[PDB]
């Protein structure tokens with residue numbers, strides 16, 4: 001399958017900056033969500049889940065087709081909770097209905113990361129909505145109850161290497177788990193994008209426990225948690241070295257995350273040679289808004 005980026009007709013950087021700004025302003029406005037975490041983290045998770053269905057072998061899934069809007073994918077057990085992100089984005093789409101669904105979902109994740117003081121994430125437009133029969137089947141997103149070998153193999157399907165995997169996982173600095181969504185008991189949560197996932201992994205005193213949903217997770221006396229797939233990053237010595245690097249270099253983590261997250265959001269898309277260059281959106285704060 002070939003999916004060629006096609007710019008929404010007549011649109012340019014300023015059109016997309018307006019969408020970014022509407023998302024950003026709504027993020028500031030709807031601050032009470034999920035015990036005052038706000039919607040930033042769920043929007044990052046949504047952008048990842050709409051992209052993480054990709055399969056490099058046949059170019060099925062991926063962000064291009066905007067297929068999360070269809071019930072099969074919307075109702076994926078792996079996507080439980082993301083409906084909150086979809087609902088947040090609904091008025092934005094109503095205000096800017098020219099934007100494609102995949103462009104909106106991916107842009108929501110970019111905006112969330114930046115507005116949460118994360119790195120700039122260059123972003124390209126041109127995803128085109130594809131029909132219902134292009135929706136990938138459920139089961140392509142990763143399990144949390146698994147080990148480092150599973151994580152490494154899993155992410156090969158998304159064409160991600162060890163450093164890309166470890167950098168992407170740093171998004172677990174954000175937000176929390178919810179027992180009703182995923183069967184994992186949430187711990188201390190934040191809504192600022194930092195390298196704190198790596199610091200938390202290395203510095204806390206972790207104990208393996210079984211939660212009320214019968215699932216194992218690692219818990220600290222300080223009140224934090226890690227998934228078994230998170231903790232795998234310090235069990236595997238390849239991943240461990242990279243964890244240590246990002247715990248000790250905030251700029252390097254930012255730079256590597258930005259590249260990996262752009263790549264995740266662009267997997268499966270062919271950009272014509274005369275497509276616009278990636279856009280780097282200004283934050284509300286940079287605009288004085």
Ligand code: HEM
Pocket residue numbers: 041042044045048080081142143144145151168169171172174175176177178179181182183184227229261
């Ligand atoms: C092995 C890979 C991964 C697994 C198994 C995994 C699993 C999970 C689980 C179980 C949750 C809790 C969902 C809920 O209960 O609401 C979660 C939340 C989250 N995940 Fe991941 N994840 C992985 C990779 C990623 C990546 C690559 C990103 C993005 C770059 C990401 C971003 C997030 C965010 C931001 C949240 C918090 C959402 C919220 O607070 O509502 N995750 N993840």
Ligand SMILES: CC(=O)Cn1cnc2ccccc21
Pocket residue numbers: 069086089090091093094097100101104105
């Ligand atoms: C309001 C609307 O046009 C619905 N809609 C159509 N595509 C969308 C993508 C994200 C959120 C909502 C979306």
Ligand SMILES: CC(=O)Cn1cnc2ccccc21
Pocket residue numbers: 172173174175176177188189196197200225226227230
């Ligand atoms: C600060 C921290 O690492 C919190 N955390 C640790 N693992 C997580 C999984 C999903 C969401 C958040 C998670």
